[PDB]
Coordinates of C-alpha atoms in Angstrom, one line a residue:
Chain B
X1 CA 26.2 -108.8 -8.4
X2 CA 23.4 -107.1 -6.9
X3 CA 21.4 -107.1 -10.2
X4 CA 21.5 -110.2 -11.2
X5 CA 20.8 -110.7 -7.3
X6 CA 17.8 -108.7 -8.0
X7 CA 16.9 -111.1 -10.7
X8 CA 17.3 -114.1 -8.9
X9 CA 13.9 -112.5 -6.8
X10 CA 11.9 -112.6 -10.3
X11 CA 13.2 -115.7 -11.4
X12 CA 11.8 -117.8 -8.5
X13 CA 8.8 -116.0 -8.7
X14 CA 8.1 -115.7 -12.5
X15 CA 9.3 -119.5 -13.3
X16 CA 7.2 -120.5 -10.3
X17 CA 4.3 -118.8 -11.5
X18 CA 4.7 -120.3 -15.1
X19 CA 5.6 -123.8 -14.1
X20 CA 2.0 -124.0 -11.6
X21 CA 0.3 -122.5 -15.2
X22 CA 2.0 -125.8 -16.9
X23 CA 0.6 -127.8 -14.2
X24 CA -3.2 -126.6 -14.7
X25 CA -2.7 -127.5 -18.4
X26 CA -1.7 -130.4 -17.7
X27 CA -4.8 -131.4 -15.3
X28 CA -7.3 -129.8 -18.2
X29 CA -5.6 -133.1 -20.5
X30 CA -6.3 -135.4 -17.9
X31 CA -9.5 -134.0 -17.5
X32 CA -10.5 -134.0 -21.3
X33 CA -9.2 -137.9 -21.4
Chain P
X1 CA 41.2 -122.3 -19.5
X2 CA 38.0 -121.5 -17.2
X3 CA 39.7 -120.4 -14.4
X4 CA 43.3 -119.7 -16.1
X5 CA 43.0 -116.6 -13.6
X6 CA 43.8 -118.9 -10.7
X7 CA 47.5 -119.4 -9.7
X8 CA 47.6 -123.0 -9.7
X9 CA 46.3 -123.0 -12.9
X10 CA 48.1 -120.2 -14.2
X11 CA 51.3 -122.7 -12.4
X12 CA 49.9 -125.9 -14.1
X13 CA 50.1 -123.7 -17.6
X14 CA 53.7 -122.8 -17.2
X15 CA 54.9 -126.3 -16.1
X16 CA 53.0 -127.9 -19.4
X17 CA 55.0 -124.8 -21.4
X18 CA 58.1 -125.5 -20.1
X19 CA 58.4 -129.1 -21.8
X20 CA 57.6 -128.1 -25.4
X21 CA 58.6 -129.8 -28.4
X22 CA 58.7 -127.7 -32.1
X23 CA 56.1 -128.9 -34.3
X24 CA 59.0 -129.2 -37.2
X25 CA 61.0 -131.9 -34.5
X26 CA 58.1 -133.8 -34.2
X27 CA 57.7 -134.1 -37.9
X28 CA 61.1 -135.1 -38.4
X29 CA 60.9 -137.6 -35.9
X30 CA 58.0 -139.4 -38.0
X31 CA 55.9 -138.4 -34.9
X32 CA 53.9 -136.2 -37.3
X33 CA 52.6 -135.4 -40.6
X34 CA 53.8 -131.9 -42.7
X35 CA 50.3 -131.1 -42.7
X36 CA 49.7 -132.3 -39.2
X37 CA 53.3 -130.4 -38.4
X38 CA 52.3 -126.8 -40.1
X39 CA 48.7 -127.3 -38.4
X40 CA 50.7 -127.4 -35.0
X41 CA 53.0 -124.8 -35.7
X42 CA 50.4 -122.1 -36.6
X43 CA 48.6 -123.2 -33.8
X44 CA 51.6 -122.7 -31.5
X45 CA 51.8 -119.3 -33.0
X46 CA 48.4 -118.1 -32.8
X47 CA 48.2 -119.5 -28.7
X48 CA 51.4 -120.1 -27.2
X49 CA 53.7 -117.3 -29.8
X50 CA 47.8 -117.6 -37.5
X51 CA 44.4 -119.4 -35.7
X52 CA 43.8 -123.2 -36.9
X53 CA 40.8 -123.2 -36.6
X54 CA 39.7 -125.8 -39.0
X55 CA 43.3 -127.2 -39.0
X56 CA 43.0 -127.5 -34.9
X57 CA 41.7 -132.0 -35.9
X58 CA 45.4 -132.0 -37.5
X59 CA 46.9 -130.7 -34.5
X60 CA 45.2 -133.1 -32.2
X61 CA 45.8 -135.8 -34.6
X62 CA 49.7 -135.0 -34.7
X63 CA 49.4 -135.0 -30.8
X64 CA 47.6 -138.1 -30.8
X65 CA 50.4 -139.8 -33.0
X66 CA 53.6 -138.2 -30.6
X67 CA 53.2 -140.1 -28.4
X68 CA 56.3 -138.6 -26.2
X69 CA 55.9 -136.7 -22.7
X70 CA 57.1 -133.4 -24.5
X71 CA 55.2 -133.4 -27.6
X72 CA 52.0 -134.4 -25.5
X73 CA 52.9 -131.5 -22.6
X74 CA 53.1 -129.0 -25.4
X75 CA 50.0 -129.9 -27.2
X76 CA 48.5 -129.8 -23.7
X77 CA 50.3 -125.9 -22.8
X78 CA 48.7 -124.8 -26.5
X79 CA 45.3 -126.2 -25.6
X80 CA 45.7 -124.2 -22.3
X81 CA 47.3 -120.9 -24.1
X82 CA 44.4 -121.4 -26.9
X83 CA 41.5 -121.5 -24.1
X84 CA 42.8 -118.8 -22.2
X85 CA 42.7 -116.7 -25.4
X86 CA 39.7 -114.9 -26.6
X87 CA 40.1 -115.8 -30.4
X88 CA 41.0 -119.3 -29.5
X89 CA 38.9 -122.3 -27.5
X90 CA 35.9 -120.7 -28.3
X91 CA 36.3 -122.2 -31.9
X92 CA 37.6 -125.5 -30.0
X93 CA 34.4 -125.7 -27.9
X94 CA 32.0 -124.7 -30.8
X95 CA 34.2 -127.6 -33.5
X96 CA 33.7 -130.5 -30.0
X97 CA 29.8 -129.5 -29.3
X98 CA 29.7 -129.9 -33.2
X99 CA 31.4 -133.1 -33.7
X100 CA 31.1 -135.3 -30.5
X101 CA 34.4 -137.0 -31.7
X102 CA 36.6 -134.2 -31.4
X103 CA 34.6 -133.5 -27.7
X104 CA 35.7 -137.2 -26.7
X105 CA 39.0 -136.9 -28.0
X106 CA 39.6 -133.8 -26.0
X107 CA 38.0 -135.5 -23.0
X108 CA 40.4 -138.9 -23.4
X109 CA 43.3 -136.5 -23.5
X110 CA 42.5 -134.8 -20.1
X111 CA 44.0 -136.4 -17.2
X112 CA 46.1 -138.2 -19.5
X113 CA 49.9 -138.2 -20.4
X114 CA 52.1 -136.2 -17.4
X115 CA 50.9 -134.1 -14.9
X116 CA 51.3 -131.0 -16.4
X117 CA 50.1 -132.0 -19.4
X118 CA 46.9 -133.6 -17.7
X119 CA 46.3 -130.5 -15.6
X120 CA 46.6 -128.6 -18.8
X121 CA 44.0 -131.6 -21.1
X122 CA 41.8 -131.0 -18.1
X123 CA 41.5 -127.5 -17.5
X124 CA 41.4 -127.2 -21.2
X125 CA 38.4 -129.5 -21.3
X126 CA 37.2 -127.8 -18.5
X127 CA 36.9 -124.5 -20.4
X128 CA 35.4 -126.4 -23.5
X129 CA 32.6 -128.1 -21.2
X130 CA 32.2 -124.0 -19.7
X131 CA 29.6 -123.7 -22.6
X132 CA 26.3 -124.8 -23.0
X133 CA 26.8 -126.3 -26.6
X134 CA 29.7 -128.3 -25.2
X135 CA 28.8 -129.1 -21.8
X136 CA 28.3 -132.9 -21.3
X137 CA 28.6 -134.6 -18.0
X138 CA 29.6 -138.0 -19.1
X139 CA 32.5 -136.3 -20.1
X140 CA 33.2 -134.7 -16.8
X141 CA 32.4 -138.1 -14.7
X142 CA 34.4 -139.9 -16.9
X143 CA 37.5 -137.0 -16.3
X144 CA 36.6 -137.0 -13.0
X145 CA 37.0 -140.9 -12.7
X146 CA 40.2 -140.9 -14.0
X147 CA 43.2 -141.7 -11.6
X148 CA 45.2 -138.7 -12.8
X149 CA 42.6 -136.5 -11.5
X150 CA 41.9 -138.4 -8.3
X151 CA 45.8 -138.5 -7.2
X152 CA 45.7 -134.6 -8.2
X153 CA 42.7 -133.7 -5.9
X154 CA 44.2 -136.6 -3.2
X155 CA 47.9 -134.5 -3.7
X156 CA 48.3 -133.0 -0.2
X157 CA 51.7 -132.0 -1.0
X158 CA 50.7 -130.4 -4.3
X159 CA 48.4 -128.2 -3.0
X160 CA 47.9 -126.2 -6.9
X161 CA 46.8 -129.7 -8.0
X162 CA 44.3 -130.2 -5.4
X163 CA 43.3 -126.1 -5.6
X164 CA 42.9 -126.5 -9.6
X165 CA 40.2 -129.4 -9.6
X166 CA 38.3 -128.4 -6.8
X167 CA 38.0 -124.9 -9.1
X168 CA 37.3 -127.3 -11.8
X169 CA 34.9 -129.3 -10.0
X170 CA 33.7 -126.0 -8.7
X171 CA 32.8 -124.2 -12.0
X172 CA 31.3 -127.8 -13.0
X173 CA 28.9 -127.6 -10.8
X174 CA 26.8 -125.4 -12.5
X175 CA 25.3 -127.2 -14.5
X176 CA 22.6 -130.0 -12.7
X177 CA 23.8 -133.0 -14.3
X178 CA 27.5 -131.9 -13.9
X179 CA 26.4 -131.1 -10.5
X180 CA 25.7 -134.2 -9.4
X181 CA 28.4 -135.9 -10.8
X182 CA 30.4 -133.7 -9.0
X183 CA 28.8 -134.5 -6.2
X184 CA 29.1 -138.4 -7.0
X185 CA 32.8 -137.6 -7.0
X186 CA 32.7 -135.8 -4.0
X187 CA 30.9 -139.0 -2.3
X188 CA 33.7 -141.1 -3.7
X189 CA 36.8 -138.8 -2.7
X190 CA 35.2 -137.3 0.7
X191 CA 38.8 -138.1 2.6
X192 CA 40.5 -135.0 0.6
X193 CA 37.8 -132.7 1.3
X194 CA 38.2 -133.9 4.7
X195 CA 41.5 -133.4 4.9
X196 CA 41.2 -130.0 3.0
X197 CA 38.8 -128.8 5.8
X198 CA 40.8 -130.3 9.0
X199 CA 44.4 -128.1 7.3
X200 CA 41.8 -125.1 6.8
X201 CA 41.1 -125.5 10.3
X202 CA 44.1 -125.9 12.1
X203 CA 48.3 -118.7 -0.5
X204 CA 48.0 -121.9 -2.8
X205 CA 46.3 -123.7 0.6
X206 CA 43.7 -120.8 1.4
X207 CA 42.8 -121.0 -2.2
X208 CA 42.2 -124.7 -2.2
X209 CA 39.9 -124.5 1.0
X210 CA 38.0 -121.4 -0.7
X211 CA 37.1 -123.9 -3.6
X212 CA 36.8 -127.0 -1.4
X213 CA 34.1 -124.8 0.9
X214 CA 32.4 -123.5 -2.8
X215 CA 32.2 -127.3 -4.1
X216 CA 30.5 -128.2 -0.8
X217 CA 28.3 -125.5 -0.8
X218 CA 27.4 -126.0 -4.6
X219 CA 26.7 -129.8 -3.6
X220 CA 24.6 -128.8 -0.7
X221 CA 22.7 -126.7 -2.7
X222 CA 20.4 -129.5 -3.7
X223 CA 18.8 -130.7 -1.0
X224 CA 19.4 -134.6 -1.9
X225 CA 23.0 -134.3 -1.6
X226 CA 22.8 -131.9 1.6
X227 CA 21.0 -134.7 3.3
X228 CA 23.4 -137.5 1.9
X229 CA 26.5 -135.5 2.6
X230 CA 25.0 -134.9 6.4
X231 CA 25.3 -138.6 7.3
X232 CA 28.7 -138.7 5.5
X233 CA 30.5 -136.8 8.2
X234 CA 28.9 -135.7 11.4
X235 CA 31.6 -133.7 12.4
X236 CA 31.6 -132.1 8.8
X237 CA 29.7 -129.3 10.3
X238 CA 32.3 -129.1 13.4
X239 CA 35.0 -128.5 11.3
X240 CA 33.5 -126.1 8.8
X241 CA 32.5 -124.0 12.1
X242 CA 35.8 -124.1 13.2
X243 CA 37.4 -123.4 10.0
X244 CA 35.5 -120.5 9.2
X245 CA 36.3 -119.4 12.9
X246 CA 40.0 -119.2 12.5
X247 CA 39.9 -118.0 8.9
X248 CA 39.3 -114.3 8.7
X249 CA 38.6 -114.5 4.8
X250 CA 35.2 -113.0 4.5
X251 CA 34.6 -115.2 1.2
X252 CA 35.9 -117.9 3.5
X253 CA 33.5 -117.3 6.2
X254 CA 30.5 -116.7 4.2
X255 CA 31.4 -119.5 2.0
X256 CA 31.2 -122.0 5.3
X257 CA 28.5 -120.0 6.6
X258 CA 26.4 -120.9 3.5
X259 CA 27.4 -124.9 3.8
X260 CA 26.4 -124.7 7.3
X261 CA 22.8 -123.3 6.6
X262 CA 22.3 -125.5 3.6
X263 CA 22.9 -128.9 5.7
X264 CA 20.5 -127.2 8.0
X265 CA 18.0 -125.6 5.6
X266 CA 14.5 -127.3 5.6
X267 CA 14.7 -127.7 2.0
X268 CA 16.9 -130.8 3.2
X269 CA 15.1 -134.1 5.1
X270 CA 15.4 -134.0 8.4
X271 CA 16.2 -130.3 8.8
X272 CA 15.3 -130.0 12.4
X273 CA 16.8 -133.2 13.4
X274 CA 19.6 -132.1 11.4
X275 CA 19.7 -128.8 13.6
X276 CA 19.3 -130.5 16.8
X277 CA 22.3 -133.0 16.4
X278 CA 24.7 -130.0 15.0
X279 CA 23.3 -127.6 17.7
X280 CA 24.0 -130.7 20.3
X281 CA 27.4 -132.1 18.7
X282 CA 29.4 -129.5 17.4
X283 CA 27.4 -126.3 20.0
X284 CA 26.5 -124.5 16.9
X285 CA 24.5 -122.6 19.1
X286 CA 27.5 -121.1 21.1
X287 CA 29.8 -120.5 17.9
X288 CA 27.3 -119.1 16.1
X289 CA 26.3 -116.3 19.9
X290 CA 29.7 -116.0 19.3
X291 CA 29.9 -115.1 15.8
X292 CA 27.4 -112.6 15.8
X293 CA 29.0 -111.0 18.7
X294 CA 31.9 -110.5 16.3
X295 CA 31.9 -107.7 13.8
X296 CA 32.0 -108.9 10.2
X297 CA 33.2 -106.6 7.5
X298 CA 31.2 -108.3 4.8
X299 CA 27.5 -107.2 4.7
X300 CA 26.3 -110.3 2.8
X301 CA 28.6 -113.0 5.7
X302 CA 27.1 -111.1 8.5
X303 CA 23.8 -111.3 6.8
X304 CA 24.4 -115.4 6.7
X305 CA 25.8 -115.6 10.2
X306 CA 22.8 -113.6 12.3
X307 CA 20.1 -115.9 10.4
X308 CA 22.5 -119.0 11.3
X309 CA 22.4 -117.4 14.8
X310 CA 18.5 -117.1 14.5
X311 CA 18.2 -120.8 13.5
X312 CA 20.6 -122.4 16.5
X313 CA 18.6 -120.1 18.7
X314 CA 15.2 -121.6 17.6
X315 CA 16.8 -125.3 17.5
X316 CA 17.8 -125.0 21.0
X317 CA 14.9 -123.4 22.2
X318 CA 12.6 -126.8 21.9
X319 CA 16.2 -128.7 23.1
X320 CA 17.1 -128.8 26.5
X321 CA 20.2 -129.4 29.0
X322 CA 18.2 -133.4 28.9
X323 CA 19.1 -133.7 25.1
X324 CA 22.7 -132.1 25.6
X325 CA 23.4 -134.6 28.0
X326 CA 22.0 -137.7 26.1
X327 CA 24.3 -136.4 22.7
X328 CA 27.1 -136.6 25.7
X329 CA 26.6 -140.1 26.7
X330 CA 25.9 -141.2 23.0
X331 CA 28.8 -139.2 22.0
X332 CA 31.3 -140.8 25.1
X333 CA 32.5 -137.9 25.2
X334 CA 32.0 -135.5 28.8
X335 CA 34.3 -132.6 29.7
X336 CA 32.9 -132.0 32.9
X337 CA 29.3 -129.9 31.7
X338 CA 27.3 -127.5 33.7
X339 CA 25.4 -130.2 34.3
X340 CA 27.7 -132.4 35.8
X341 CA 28.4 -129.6 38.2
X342 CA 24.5 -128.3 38.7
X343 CA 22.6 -130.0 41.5
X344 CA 19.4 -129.1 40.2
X345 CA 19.7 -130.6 37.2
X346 CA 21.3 -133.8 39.2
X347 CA 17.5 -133.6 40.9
X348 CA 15.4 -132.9 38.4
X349 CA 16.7 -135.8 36.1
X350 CA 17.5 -138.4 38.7
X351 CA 14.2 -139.8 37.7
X352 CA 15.0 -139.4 34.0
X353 CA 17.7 -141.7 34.5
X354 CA 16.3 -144.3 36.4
X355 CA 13.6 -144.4 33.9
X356 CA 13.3 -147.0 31.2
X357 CA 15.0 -149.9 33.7
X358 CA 18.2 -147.5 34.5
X359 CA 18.7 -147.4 30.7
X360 CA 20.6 -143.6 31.2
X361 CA 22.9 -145.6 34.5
X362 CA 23.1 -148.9 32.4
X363 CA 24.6 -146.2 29.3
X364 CA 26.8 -144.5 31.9
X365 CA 28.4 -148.1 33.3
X366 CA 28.9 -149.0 30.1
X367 CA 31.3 -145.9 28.9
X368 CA 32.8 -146.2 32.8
X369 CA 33.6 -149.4 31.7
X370 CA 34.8 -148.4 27.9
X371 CA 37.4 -146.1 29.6
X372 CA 38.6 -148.0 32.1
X373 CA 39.2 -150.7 29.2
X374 CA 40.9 -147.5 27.8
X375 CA 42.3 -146.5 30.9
X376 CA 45.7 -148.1 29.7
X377 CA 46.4 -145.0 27.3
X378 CA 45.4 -142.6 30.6
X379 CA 45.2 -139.6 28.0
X380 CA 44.0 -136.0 29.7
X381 CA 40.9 -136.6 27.3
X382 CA 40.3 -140.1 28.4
X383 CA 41.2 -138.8 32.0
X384 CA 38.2 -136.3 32.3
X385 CA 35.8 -138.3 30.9
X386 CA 36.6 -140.9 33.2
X387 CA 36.3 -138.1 35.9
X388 CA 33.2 -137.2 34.6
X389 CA 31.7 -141.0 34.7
X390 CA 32.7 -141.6 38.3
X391 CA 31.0 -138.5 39.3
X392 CA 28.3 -138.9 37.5
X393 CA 28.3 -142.2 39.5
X394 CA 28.5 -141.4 42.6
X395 CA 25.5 -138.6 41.9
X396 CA 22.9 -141.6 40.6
X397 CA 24.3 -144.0 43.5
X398 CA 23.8 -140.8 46.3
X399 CA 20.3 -140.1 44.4
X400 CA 18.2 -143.2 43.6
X401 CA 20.1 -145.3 45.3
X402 CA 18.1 -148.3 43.1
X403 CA 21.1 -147.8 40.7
X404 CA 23.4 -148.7 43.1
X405 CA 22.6 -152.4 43.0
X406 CA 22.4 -152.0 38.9
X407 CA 25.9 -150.8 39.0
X408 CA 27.1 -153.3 40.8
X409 CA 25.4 -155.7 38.8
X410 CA 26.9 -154.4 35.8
X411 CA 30.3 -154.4 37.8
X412 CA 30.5 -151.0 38.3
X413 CA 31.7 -151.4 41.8
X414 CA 34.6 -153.2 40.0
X415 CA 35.3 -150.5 37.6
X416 CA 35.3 -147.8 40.5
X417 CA 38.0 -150.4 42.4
X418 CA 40.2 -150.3 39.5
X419 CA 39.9 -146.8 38.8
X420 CA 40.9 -146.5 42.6
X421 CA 44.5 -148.0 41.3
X422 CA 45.1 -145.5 38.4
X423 CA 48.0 -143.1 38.2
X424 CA 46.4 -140.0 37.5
X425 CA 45.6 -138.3 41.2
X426 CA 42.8 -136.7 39.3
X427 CA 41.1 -140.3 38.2
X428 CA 42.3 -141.7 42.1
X429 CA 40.5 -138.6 43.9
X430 CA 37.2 -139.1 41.6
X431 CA 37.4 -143.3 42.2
X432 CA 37.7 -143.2 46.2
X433 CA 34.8 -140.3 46.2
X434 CA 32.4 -142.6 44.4
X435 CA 33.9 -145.5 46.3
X436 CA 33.0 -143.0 49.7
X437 CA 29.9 -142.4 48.2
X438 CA 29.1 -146.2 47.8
X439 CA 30.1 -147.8 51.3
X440 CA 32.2 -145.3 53.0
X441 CA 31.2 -142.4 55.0
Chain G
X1 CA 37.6 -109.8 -15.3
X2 CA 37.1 -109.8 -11.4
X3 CA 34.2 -108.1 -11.8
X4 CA 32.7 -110.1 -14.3
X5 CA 33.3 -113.2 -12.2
X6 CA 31.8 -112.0 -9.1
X7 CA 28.5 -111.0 -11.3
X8 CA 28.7 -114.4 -12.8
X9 CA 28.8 -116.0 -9.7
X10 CA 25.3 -113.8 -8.8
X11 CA 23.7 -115.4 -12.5
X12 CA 24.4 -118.3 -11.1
X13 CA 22.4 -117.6 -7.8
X14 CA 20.0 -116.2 -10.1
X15 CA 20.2 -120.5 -11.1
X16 CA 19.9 -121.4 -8.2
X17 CA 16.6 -119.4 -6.7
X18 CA 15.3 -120.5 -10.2
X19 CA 16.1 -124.3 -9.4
X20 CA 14.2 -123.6 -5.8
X21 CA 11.1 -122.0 -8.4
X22 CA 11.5 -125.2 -10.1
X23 CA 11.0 -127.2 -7.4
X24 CA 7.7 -125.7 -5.9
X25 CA 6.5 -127.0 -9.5
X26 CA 6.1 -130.2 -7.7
X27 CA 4.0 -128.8 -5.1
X28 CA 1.5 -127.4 -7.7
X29 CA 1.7 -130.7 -9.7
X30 CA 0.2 -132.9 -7.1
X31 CA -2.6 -130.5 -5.8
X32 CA -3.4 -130.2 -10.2
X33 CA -3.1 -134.3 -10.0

């Protein structure tokens, strides 16, 4: 329990740090249009 | 099945075994075919005792076609065996994500035919929907919308019913969309978690309220349904409090702990107004002082109970003994409080309820009123807070005595007189006080 | 199997704190926006 406790810590900070990435990409279309 | 491991499911199982009918009689009885017959039997062999893996279509088709109690409560009790197996179900699941027939099929037969055998279909399709591949939630809404499965959870008397499909619903959960059509069912069928908390508060029922409190928790754990859910049942939080007070379970306990944070967690709307009506309403504040007074075996459950602590501390912190007392008067309900009782406070809020046109006196004759109209039933309840109004009374017609000619507008006086009358010596002693208080010395 | 339940139970915290990374995706998307 305690390591996938552990993982739950880098899971909502990984995913959080990949899904703002997303949302930069996704201004750099609206951008270019 | 997915939780086979629990005893009413592990009950369920042995009930749908115990009306089996051979694969060979069914055949014989035209309520199969040989293949569909010898598809049966090996399957019966390789669960209940050679896997049919391929052959498993014949052996819902011959279930399909016997369309007696006993031939249906056996298929059902070798879906269940196969599930529980390792070798088994898997091949089931991985044949019904494939072929969205055989998925529907398996979902039409859950909650379907008797009650063992429905329990069976449905903790069978549960374990079959366990898997990504197969996981669908029309399937599960449209289980969970069946009646079977609604007088199963509604069964107070068969408490493994209700404990197996709030495990169901439980392990559901999981997934979002399952998630919220659990909690869709969950907004449909509130009375049985209701109920399941109010027997919790005041074995096969411990069980049930450990996966009742889960459900809830899993529910709350989006922040939509937390808020929705809040409004449902303002008491919800009351009971789960008290619940989790009398259980000693440390699952229990954190399990409750964990619903009561989630209604209360900011992710929710109206978090601090949330906090503030719990911490007023139900004294979350004082249970959860209490609570963390109390030693708690469980690291993680004390963990959740000092930061529930920390929360009703900072939520009464901006509240004060004003907003306790206007939750009292909305609430009708007064059991003689500390402010009641407290001068001071009687002075410092004399003003405060004089103010807006005596809106606080014109709240209080109104509920003098309510329980003088209830008065008839004279219950100890009804008694003290009609104590509780008549002294109140008499301290805003003593102190501002502008109220005084409010109150008797408002036919206070009148109330008071007919309070004088009552049986109760408690109710006659408050009545010719305020009456004293009024015109006497 | 007990203990593979309880550790299942943790994965699906790990879920969970990965649904709440999820959700401060909308707080990056309307900033990018």
């Amino acid at each position: 329990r305690k390591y996938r406790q552990d993982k739950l810590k880098q899971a909502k900070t990984d995913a959080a740090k990949e899904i703002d990435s997303y949302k930069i990409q996704k201004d750099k279309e609206l951008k270019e249009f | 099945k997915i939780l086979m491991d629990s005893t009413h499911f592990n009950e369920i199982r042995s009930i749908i075994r115990s009306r089996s009918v051979a694969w060979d009689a069914l055949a014989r009885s035209e309520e199969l075919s040989e293949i569909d017959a010898s598809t049966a039997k090996a399957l019966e062999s390789i669960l209940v005792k050679k896997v049919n893996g391929k052959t498993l279509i014949p052996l819902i088709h011959l279930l399909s076609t016997s369309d007696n109690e006993d031939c249906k409560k056996s298929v059902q009790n070798l879906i269940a065996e196969l599930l529980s197996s390792d070798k088994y179900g898997d091949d089931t699941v991985k044949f019904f994500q494939e072929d969205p027939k055989q998925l529907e099929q398996l979902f039409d037969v859950s909650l379907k035919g008797d009650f063992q055998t429905v329990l069976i279909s449905g903790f069978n399709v549960v374990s079959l929907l366990v898997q990504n591949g197969l996981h669908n939630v029309k399937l599960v809404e449209k289980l969970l919308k069946n009646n079977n499965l609604i007088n199963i959870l509604q069964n107070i008397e068969q408490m493994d019913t209700c404990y197996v499909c709030i495990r169901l619903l439980q392990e559901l959960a999981v997934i979002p969309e399952y998630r919220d059509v659990i909690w869709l069912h969950e907004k449909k069928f509130m009375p049985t978690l209701f109920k399941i908390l109010q027997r919790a508060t005041d074995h096969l029922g411990i069980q049930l309220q450990y996966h009742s409190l889960l459900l809830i928790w899993l529910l709350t754990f989006n922040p939509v349904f937390a808020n929705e859910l809040v409004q449902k049942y303002l008491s919800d939080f009351l009971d789960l409090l008290k619940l989790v007070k009398i259980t000693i379970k440390e699952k229990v306990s954190r399990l409750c702990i964990s619903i009561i944070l989630q209604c209360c967690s900011t992710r929710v709307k109206q978090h601090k107004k949330v906090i503030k009506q719990l911490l007023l309403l139900g004294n979350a504040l004082p249970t959860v002082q209490s609570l963390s007074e109390r030693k708690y075996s469980d690291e993680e459950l004390r963990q959740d109970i000092s930061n529930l602590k920390e929360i009703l501390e900072n939520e009464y912190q901006e509240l004060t003994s004003f907003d306790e007392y206007v939750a009292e008067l909305d609430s009708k309900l007064l059991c003689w409080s500390p402010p009641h009782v407290d001068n001071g406070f009687w002075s410092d809020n004399i003003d405060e309820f004089k103010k807006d046109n005596y809106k606080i006196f014109r709240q209080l004759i109104e509920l003098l009123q309510a329980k003088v109209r209830n008065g008839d039933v004279n219950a100890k309840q009804e008694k003290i807070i009609i104590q509780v109004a008549l002294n109140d009374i008499t301290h805003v017609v003593e102190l501002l005595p502008e109220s005084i000619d409010v109150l008797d507008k408002t036919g206070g006086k009148a109330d008071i007189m007919e309070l004088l009358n009552h049986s109760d010596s408690r109710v006659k002693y408050e009545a010719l006080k305020a009456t004293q208080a009024i015109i006497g010395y | 199997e007990a203990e593979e339940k309880a550790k299942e139970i943790q994965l699906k915290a790990d879920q969970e704190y990965e649904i709440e990374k999820t959700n401060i995706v909308r707080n990056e998307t309307n900033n990018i926006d």
